[PDB]
Amino acid sequence: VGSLNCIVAVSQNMGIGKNGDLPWPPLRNEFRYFQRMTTTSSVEGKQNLVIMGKKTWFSIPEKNRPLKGRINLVLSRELKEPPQGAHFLSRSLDDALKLTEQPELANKVDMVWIVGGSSVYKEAMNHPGHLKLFVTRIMQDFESDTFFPEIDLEKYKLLPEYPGVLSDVQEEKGIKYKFEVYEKND
Numbered sequence: 001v002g003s004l005n006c007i008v009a010v011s012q013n014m015g016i017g018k019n020g021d022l023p024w025p026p027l028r029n030e031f032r033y034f035q036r037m038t039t040t041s042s043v044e045g046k047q048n049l050v051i052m053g054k055k056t057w058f059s060i061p062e063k064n065r066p067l068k069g070r071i072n073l074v075l076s077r078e079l080k081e082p083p084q085g086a087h088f089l090s091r092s093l094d095d096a097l098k099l100t101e102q103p104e105l106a107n108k109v110d111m112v113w114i115v116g117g118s119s120v121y122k123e124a125m126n127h128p129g130h131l132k133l134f135v136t137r138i139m140q141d142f143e144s145d146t147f148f149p150e151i152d153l154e155k156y157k158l159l160p161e162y163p164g165v166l167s168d169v170q171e172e173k174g175i176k177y178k179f180e181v182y183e184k185n186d
C-alpha cells in the first residue's frame with residue numbers, strides 16, 4: 001500500500017460545500033485535476049483507494065458512483081452495509097486504513113486518497129506519519145455550510161512545486177485558483 005494523501009478544493013473563506021454541492025459553479029479543469037490525481041496509480045495492476053464520508057458519497061451524481069477506476073470506501077457509523085454501488089464501508093478512518101492490511105485490499109490498492117468531507121480531513125490531517133495535502137485554493141469567497149480545517153503550519157511544509165502539478169494561477173468561468181501541495185512526516 002502506497003502513500004496517504006488528502007485532496008480538497010477550498011474557497012478563501014475555507015468553504016468546501018453548500019447544500020450538498022460545491023460552493024462555486026463547476027470548474028471543469030479542477031474536476032479533471034481531481035479525477036487524474038486520485039485515479040493515476042504508479043503501480044501496474046493496482047488501483048488507488050478513495051475514502052470519503054457518507055455525505056460526500058451521496059453528493060456525487062448517481063451516474064458517477066462509484067468513482068470509476070478507483071476502489072471506493074465510505075465512512076459511516078450509521079450505515080450497516082456499503083451504500084448501493086459501493087463495496088467497502090468503515091466506521092472510522094483508522095478502521096479503513098487497517099482494512100488496507102487485509103488481503104482483499106492489500107493486493108489491490110496503491111495510493112490512498114481522502115476526498116472529503118470536513119470530519120474525514122480532520123481525522124486524516126491529525127493522523128501520524130507521512131501525509132500530503134493536495135489543496136486547490138479557490139481565490140474567491142463563496143457561501144458555504146461545510147469547511148476545511150485550517151492547516152497546522154507547525155506540522156506541514158508547503159512545497160513550491162510538485163511533479164506533474166502546475167504551480168501557476170488557473171482561471172475558469174471568471175474564477176482564479178491555484179494547486180498547492182503540503183507535506184508532513186511526524
Ligand SMILES: NC(=O)c1ccc[n+]([C@@H]2O[C@H](COP(=O)([O-])OP(=O)(O)OC[C@H]3O[C@@H](n4cnc5c(N)ncnc54)[C@H](OP(=O)(O)O)[C@@H]3O)[C@@H](O)[C@H]2O)c1
Pocket residue numbers: 007008009010015016017018019020021022052053054055056057059075076077078079090091092093115116117118119120123146147
Ligand atoms: N470542495 C471539496 O473538495 C469537497 C470534497 C468533498 C465534499 N465536498 C462537498 O462537502 C459536502 C459533504 O461534506 P461533509 O463534511 O458535509 O460530510 P462527509 O464527511 O462527507 O459525511 C459526513 C458523514 O460521514 C460520516 N463521517 C465523516 N467523517 C467520518 C469519520 N472520520 N469517521 C467516521 N465517519 C465519518 C459520518 O456519517 P454517520 O453519521 O453515518 O456516521 C458523517 O455524518 C458536500 O457539500 C460536498 O459537495 C467538497
Ligand SMILES: CCc1nc(N)nc(N)c1OCCCOc1ccccc1C[C@H](C)C(=O)O
Pocket residue numbers: 007008009020021022030031034056059060061064067114115116136
Ligand atoms: C472536483 C471537486 C474536488 N476537488 C478537489 N480538488 N478535491 C476534492 N476532494 C473534490 O471533491 C470531489 C468529490 C467527488 O465529487 C465528484 C466526483 C465525480 C463526479 C462528480 C462529483 C461531484 C461534483 C464535484 C459536485 O459535487 O458538483
Ligand SMILES: [Cl-]
Pocket residue numbers: 149150151
Ligand atoms: Cl489553511
